[PDB]
Amino acid sequence: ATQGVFTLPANTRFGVTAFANSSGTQTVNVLVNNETAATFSGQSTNNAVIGTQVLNSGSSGKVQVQVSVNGRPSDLVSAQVILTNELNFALVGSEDGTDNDYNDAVVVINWPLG
Amino acid sequence: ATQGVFTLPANTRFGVTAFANSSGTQTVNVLVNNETAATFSGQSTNNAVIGTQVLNSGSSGKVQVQVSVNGRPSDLVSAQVILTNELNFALVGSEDGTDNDYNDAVVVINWPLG
Amino acid sequence: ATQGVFTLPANTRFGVTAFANSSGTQTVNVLVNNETAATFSGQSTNNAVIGTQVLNSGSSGKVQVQVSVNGRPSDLVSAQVILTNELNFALVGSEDGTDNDYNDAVVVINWPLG
Amino acid sequence: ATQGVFTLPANTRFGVTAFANSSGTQTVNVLVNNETAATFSGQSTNNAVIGTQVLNSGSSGKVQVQVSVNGRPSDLVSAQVILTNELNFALVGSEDGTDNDYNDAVVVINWPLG
Numbered sequence: 001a002t003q004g005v006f007t008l009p010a011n012t013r014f015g016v017t018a019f020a021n022s023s024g025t026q027t028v029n030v031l032v033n034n035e036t037a038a039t040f041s042g043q044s045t046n047n048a049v050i051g052t053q054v055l056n057s058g059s060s061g062k063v064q065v066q067v068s069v070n071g072r073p074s075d076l077v078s079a080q081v082i083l084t085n086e087l088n089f090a091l092v093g094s095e096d097g098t099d100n101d102y103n104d105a106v107v108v109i110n111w112p113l114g
Numbered sequence: 115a116t117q118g119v120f121t122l123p124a125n126t127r128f129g130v131t132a133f134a135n136s137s138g139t140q141t142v143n144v145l146v147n148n149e150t151a152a153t154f155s156g157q158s159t160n161n162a163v164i165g166t167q168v169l170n171s172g173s174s175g176k177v178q179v180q181v182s183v184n185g186r187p188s189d190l191v192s193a194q195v196i197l198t199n200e201l202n203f204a205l206v207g208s209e210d211g212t213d214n215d216y217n218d219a220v221v222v223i224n225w226p227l228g
Numbered sequence: 229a230t231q232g233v234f235t236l237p238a239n240t241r242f243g244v245t246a247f248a249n250s251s252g253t254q255t256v257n258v259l260v261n262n263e264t265a266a267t268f269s270g271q272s273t274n275n276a277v278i279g280t281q282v283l284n285s286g287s288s289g290k291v292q293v294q295v296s297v298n299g300r301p302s303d304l305v306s307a308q309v310i311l312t313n314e315l316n317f318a319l320v321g322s323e324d325g326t327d328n329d330y331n332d333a334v335v336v337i338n339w340p341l342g
Numbered sequence: 343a344t345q346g347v348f349t350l351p352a353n354t355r356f357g358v359t360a361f362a363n364s365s366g367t368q369t370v371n372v373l374v375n376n377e378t379a380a381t382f383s384g385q386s387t388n389n390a391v392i393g394t395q396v397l398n399s400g401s402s403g404k405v406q407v408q409v410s411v412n413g414r415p416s417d418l419v420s421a422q423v424i425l426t427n428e429l430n431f432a433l434v435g436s437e438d439g440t441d442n443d444y445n446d447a448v449v450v451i452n453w454p455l456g
């Protein structure tokens with residue numbers, strides 16, 4: 001199944017934050033309406049924040065997260081959760097190796113803001 | 115129901131990260147086994163990452179998030195989600211006012227790390 | 229925070245299914261647009277299905293689950309989860325007593341159908 | 343990532359319930375410790391409950407959901423959610439065709455019971 005793709009309400013600000021947990025340098029690309037809107041890159045085995053940004057979901061509301069390590073695409077796992085019918089989280093884990101911890105880059109998208 | 119309380123794996127590192135979306139200054143406390151282990155604070159209406167920290171869940175694994183604004187506890191909402199039977203997120207929203215957006219402080223706990 | 233209230237896409241059919249795990253008879257009301265659209269009742273300590281139906285979210289998309297036992301509303305917990313950006317679950321637990329298992333009536337809403 | 347595999351607490355009763363939404367007859371097998379413990383089959387485009395049963399997670403706690411149509415495995419998507427640190431749902435969708443509604447068989451596992 002496709003992972004790392006989310007439909008947000010149109011024309012809405014959202015937060016995106018990425019964390020790293022791997023020996024490999026993580027590259028996280030965030031695409032809005034199929035065009036790169038943010039790219040984060042860093043290396044940590046201690047959950048360091050490697051980027052945070054506020055983006056607009058645009059007319060389509062389509063947001064996609066991709067993760068790679070030195071050009072090799074990581075396998076993704078994702079879901080969306082909504083609390084009290086108001087607070088949205090789109091969550092992504094990724095695996096760059098063999099241990100299947102899926103934390104090598106972790107990406108959290110949240111909306112609405114403000 | 116009780117909200118903002120999670121049973122983590124014992125003795126395990128976790129990340130805790132807080133975001134602010136309110137006119138009021140947020141104060142987020144993270145309790146491990148009922149003692150304060152981290153405190154974050156800030157004021158943003160654009161999802162500022164007012165704190166992020168790596169903590170250990172301790173012998174009991176009990177982790178609790180509390181949020182206050184203007185010296186008054188915020189109402190909390192929370193859930194935990196597990197992806198691919200391994201990757202965990204404990205999610206908290208909080209409301210300091212009347213609009214019930216529940217994003218005034220948002221807290222994400224993630225494990226495993228490394 | 230309010231629980232058991234979900235905004236579905238408008239005019240979209242959904243499944244609703246209730247399970248019982250309690251000494252007491254559970255009465256589950258499912259509201260669409262703030263009117264009762266279905267009512268299920270039964271008693272089980274073995275997770276019996278006490279009702280299942282297809283309903284339409286209608287023009288507002290507003291769906292609410294209420295649970296009563298022994299003449300009083302049960303305390304509710306809920307969340308929505310979306311898998312592969314396609315499959316939606318709105319999930320409700322409820323507590324009629326003191327043990328806080330929150331399974332006394334469990335309600336699962338899923339969409340889309342067909 | 344692997345989907346449809348969950349680790350439950352050992353020696354614990356859980357509910358498993360399957361719904362169908364497809365022109366094809368769905369076959370759902372629920373494995374506990376790698377042995378089939380329940381099987382449901384049926385065709386519906388109206389979210390019929392093609393089966394619901396109480397199982398025991400046994401010594402291993404390992405529960406796997408498999409979905410097929412006439413022996414051809416469907417593609418799975420899954421996650422687990424925990425409400426109020428107590429109430430657990432393991433969720434599975436499946437896709438037997440090309441439209442990616444992922445509702446062709448939907449399986450919900452819930453615990454605790456009673």
Ligand SMILES: C[C@@H]1O[C@@H](O)[C@@H](O)[C@H](O)[C@@H]1O
Nearest residue numbers: 021022023097099101228
């Ligand atoms: C230090 C290790 O680095 C890579 O091998 C990751 O895939 C592992 O999960 C671990 O983080």
Ligand SMILES: C[C@@H]1O[C@@H](O)[C@@H](O)[C@H](O)[C@@H]1O
Nearest residue numbers: 114135136137211213215
């Ligand atoms: C700017 C406003 O500040 C407080 O009133 C919050 O409770 C509102 O949600 C909004 O963020």
Ligand SMILES: C[C@@H]1O[C@@H](O)[C@@H](O)[C@H](O)[C@@H]1O
Nearest residue numbers: 249250251325327329456
């Ligand atoms: C058999 C018992 O019945 C009621 O007391 C429920 O609140 C309990 O959770 C348990 O199901």
Ligand SMILES: C[C@@H]1O[C@@H](O)[C@@H](O)[C@H](O)[C@@H]1O
Nearest residue numbers: 342363364365439441443
């Ligand atoms: C009626 C159709 O039957 C199969 O083609 C399913 O894959 C479709 O999702 C739809 O349910």
Ligand SMILES: [Ca+2]
Nearest residue numbers: 097100101102
């Ligand atoms: Ca890894």
Ligand SMILES: [Ca+2]
Nearest residue numbers: 021101104228
């Ligand atoms: Ca890792």
Ligand SMILES: [Ca+2]
Nearest residue numbers: 211215216218
């Ligand atoms: Ca607010």
Ligand SMILES: [Ca+2]
Nearest residue numbers: 114135136218
């Ligand atoms: Ca706010």
Ligand SMILES: [Ca+2]
Nearest residue numbers: 325329330332
């Ligand atoms: Ca109870």
Ligand SMILES: [Ca+2]
Nearest residue numbers: 249329332456
């Ligand atoms: Ca009960």
Ligand SMILES: [Ca+2]
Nearest residue numbers: 442443444446
């Ligand atoms: Ca399908």
Ligand SMILES: [Ca+2]
Nearest residue numbers: 342363443446
């Ligand atoms: Ca279908």
